[PDB]
Amino acid sequence: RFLKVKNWETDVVLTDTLHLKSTLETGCTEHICMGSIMLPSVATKDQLFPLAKEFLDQYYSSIKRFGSKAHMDRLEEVNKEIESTSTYQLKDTELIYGAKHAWRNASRCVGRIQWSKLQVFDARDCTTAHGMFNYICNHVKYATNKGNLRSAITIFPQRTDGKHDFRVWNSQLIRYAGYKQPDGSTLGDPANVQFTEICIQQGWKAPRGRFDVLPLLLQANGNDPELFQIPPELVLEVPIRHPKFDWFKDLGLKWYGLPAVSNMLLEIGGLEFSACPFSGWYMGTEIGVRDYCDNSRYNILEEVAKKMDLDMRKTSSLWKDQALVEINIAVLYSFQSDKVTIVDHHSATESFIKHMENEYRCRGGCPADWVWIVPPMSGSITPVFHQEMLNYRLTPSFEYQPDPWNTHVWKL
Amino acid sequence: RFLKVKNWETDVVLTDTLHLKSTLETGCTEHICMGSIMLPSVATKDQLFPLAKEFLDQYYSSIKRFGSKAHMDRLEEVNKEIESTSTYQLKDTELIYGAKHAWRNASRCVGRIQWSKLQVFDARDCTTAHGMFNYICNHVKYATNKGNLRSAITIFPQRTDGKHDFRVWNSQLIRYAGYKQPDGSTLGDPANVQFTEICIQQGWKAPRGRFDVLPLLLQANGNDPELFQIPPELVLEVPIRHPKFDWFKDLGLKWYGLPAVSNMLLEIGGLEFSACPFSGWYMGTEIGVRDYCDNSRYNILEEVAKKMDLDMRKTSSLWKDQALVEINIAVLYSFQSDKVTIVDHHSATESFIKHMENEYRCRGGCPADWVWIVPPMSGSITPVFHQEMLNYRLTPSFEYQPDPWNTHVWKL
Numbered sequence A, B: 001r002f003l004k005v006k007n008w009e010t011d012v013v014l015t016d017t018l019h020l021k022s023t024l025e026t027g028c029t030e031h032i033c034m035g036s037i038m039l040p041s042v043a044t045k046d047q048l049f050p051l052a053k054e055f056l057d058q059y060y061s062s063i064k065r066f067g068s069k070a071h072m073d074r075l076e077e078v079n080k081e082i083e084s085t086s087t088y089q090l091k092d093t094e095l096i097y098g099a100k101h102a103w104r105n106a107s108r109c110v111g112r113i114q115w116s117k118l119q120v121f122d123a124r125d126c127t128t129a130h131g132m133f134n135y136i137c138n139h140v141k142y143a144t145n146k147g148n149l150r151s152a153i154t155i156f157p158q159r160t161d162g163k164h165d166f167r168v169w170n171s172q173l174i175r176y177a178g179y180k181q182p183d184g185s186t187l188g189d190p191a192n193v194q195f196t197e198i199c200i201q202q203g204w205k206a207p208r209g210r211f212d213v214l215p216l217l218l219q220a221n222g223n224d225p226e227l228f229q230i231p232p233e234l235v236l237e238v239p240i241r242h243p244k245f246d247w248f249k250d251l252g253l254k255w256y257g258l259p260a261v262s263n264m265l266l267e268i269g270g271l272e273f274s275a276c277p278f279s280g281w282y283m284g285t286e287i288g289v290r291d292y293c294d295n296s297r298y299n300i301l302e303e304v305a306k307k308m309d310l311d312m313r314k315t316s317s318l319w320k321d322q323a324l325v326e327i328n329i330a331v332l333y334s335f336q337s338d339k340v341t342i343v344d345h346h347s348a349t350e351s352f353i354k355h356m357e358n359e360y361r362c363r364g365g366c367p368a369d370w371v372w373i374v375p376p377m378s379g380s381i382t383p384v385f386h387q388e389m390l391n392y393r394l395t396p397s398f399e400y401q402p403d404p405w406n407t408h409v410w411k412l
């Protein structure tokens, strides 16, 4: 019950004890492992104080005032507020702590070496969709910082009864539009055709092109959501060129600078923040491999191999592989030459190994999801391929949640 | 308890029921997943008949004579033999069935679309190390078939008391030698320096070069093992050249045609065959990615990028990625131009999807280990990246076993 994880490139072994503090369930049993399933399987007052207590015990353990009176009174204070209101409110300091540690515990995140440099924006006084748009714009402007990207999170009011929720319906703050065609094919991003749908169904007059930035669909206090278009001066975009292949520009491609997940739920001490958009900087493969070359996304391996003069008749000519490397050297090169923060999969996966080392040392482990930590190209020549990893759920945490256009009791 | 696995490239869903027949344990619990651990965690007469029965029930269920008298008498016959001898002996037909299904159930194998075309060689009458060498040579000659590779397994006598075992100490029948250097570096294959050690410690006069084929270390009936050198005419090797880069040959590289795992244990109806070397044909990435570019193996990304004229100062120039594709196009090209069977990672991963489909259809599922099915380069542009998979242990099965030079009560 004090398990070992081995590196088979360097023979390094580390002992994981942190998994004992694990609480939630993984989906695996003694008889079946689900480590490759993408997402496997209202709260009451009685359930709440345990979670509040457990969170408060580790927060006070963190600043080395574990059993102080400040702890004991905060324990009693939160209990009384869960008695009086059946819920409770986080101190500003407990909100920053819980947010940083939700990132820290995100086992599918390879970037977590940065987990303690997170700017937390307290948006819990927001009441209207216009207010969110304002908070969200301030987040985009800050996090972007003129290409010197900065990591940030904006935390909107916590769930209360359930039907007053606050949701950003967008899956990312900044995404390109998806338009099906009359001939069946797709313009823009096929991932977003169902979301691009609702925007038009709500009055978005679409500039039916490729890289059309979508409008924010913000829902406040369970009310029907409302469209707001981000000032284009705040949407920083990088035009993609190759450092050797001059025909690259005629491909006419670009991506946005800022990756910002907006569809997840932040859980802290048993309180649920259903709108918590958070941003970092891109690892290059997210764009060059998945965004551009997923079959059901932009799907550009066809044209890149064309202008490279490649043997596309035979599968075993690895034309697909060869065009995938060039695309990623160019995504990397274009961001760097505009001073926009980006990290290659080699540097990122090395840092995560080093971070993992710090976590086993000063924390006793580090929950990691191999299936997600290994980059989607050149796997075994990055050091995370050869690193055994233990996956387990720790809290505070980011969780998935139903897409809001399936839950919502819609009306007007 | 009738789980679903989804493909996120094609939206295809399949229902897995086969996992209910799962028996062994995976290493995961409800609270921790070990799907990325490489290998996680004498038999008595009382344990044996259940396993014999379970195996016999599915074998007779397979030829559509489930509850026949031929089944009932074979059940009684094996029971009586487990009473009389505390063990039992497989019919030739039960040996071929069990072997084919051990391959079928090998969840880390992407090639299993071929699982029913397996030539089974019954070596259970063997008694001496010289006999094994003879059986093993006949296997190499057959399986190689002049580059028209054929899949085969040779099954030596089953474990009895424990200290009369039969083991092939080699991890593969055909591997290149590993020699450390006086200056610390390594010649040949660094994976094999500890095994190349014992060979020399047993009288192997090493031709201390790079691609020196190793001698077989065969142990028969628990006796101390003995060296035998495979006739070089039976060891077919492919010289690696690129279809564009003429400097490629001066790298002077070659690999052997036949991949043949020899260090695993075959479990059938509770009987344990500790020497069961089995062979197929190579997926190209096993050679071009892992053998050649693993840091602790041949580690050739240095020199290939050199003669390509690449930016090796900067990590984010993806020089490593670009030299990895070229190496794999050349491994593929060299094998094909000599008519030696090899499969690219695209064709192989497509077939496994199709095989998976057949298994959910006519069998109710297919145990798969994602971490091992996804190829070690260009992951997400092959269809297995996007395919959820359930892992569970079915029997008959191939299992790992201690390296014999740690178990052996050695003497002379």
Ligand code: HEM
Binding pocket: A103, A106, A108, A109, A110, A111, A112, A114, A118, A151, A152, A153, A278, A279, A280, A281, A282, A283, A286, A343, A348, A372, A398
């Ligand atoms: C600072 C730079 C960061 C980098 C380079 C980075 C890198 C990555 C990458 C490559 C993924 C793979 C997921 C995918 O393929 O879509 C990921 C997922 C994730 N990241 Fe990080 N990340 C960063 C910052 C952050 C921050 C600030 C947070 C939260 C406060 C965060 C939380 C997560 C979570 C929760 C996931 C997985 C959830 C999901 O996508 O299903 N990351 N990250």
Ligand code: HEM
Binding pocket: B103, B106, B108, B109, B110, B111, B112, B114, B118, B151, B152, B153, B278, B279, B280, B281, B282, B283, B286, B343, B348, B372, B398
């Ligand atoms: C017919 C062509 C075959 C191909 C193309 C193929 C392909 C592969 C590949 C790529 C792996 C990855 C393992 C690694 O990276 O080292 C693997 C593993 C494995 N194969 Fe298959 N295979 C074939 C035939 C067979 C046969 C005939 C058997 C047994 C009778 C078998 C049983 C296994 C097992 C048990 C493993 C995993 C055990 C381990 O390596 O730890 N395969 N195979």
Ligand SMILES: C[C@H](O)[C@H](O)[C@H]1CNc2nc(N)[nH]c(=O)c2N1
Binding pocket: A008, A385, A386, A387, A388, A389, B036, B037, B038, B371, B372, B373
């Ligand atoms: C730590 C990790 O389990 C290890 O690198 C595994 C990952 N997946 C693999 N997959 C295959 N096919 N072969 C391997 O050697 C490995 N190595």
Ligand SMILES: C[C@H](O)[C@H](O)[C@H]1CNc2nc(N)[nH]c(=O)c2N1
Binding pocket: A036, A037, A038, A371, A372, A373, B008, B385, B386, B387, B388, B389
């Ligand atoms: C089926 C499989 O779980 C799915 O393709 C996963 C695999 N690993 C991944 N890893 C990352 N980082 N991102 C992904 O979208 C996925 N997709």
Ligand SMILES: Cc1cc(N)nc(CCCN(C)C)c1
Binding pocket: A111, A259, A260, A261, A278, A279, A280, A281, A282, A283, A286
């Ligand atoms: C914070 C953050 C960092 C990063 N590098 N990438 C993202 C986008 C993740 C998109 N996937 C959820 C589809 C977010």
Ligand SMILES: Cc1cc(N)nc(CCCN(C)C)c1
Binding pocket: B111, B259, B260, B261, B278, B279, B280, B281, B282, B283, B286
């Ligand atoms: C039968 C078989 C097929 C294949 N394609 N490859 C192998 C070698 C596997 C080596 N690993 C165990 C290190 C064996």
Ligand SMILES: [Zn+2]
Binding pocket: A028, A032, A033, A034, A035, B028, B032, B033, B034, B035
């Ligand atoms: Zn698992």
